[PDB]
Every structure is written in C-alpha cells, then in structure tokens.
Amino acid sequence: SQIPASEQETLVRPKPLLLKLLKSVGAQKDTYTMKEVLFYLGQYIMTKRLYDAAQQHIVYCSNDLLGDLFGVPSFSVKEHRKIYTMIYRNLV
C-alpha cells in the first residue's frame, strides 16, 4: 500500500504514550506532521534495533512499548497504510 503526498503533511497530536516514544529519540513538541512522527518512529526502530537483520523491512515489536502501541507483534515497513492506521489509532 501507498499514501498520497498530501496525507504526509497532516498535523497530528500523538497520545502521551506515543509522545513518550517520540521523546526518547529527541522529539520535544506535542504536534507534528505525519512525516515528522514517521521520522522519529524510524529513529526509534533503528536505535532499539527492532528490525530484522536479514530482511530489513520486517520490524519486531512483541516485547517493546511500540508493540503495545501498535497492538501487533511485528509488521512490515512495506505496509504503508497499516502503519499510518496504527499511528492514527494513537492520536489525541
């Protein structure tokens, strides 16, 4: 799946728990573009080494706060719409 360009610019307010994750990788504000949320989420996945070393599009979050936020043990980075939905489910 793929996201139209205009949706990447959508201004969102992450819930406290998602904000905590983002803050851990440097984010200091309360309102972000979806693009910005995705940047910090990427940084968080990289720092915590949650992606598979062989197929680097698979992310393992079963034993992490990311997994509790997304309600999935794993996901593929290729599922753009599923990822956007998981972020929209954690706004305020």
């Binding site: 995705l38 990289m46 992606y51 680097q56 599009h57």
Partner: peptide
Amino acid sequence: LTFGEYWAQLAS
C-alpha cells in the same frame, strides 16, 4: 534494502 531505505519510502 537497508531499513532506512524502506523507511524513507514510507515517510515520502
């Protein structure tokens, strides 16, 4: 690809 390359496709 590297995780970064896949992730960059998702952000843009």
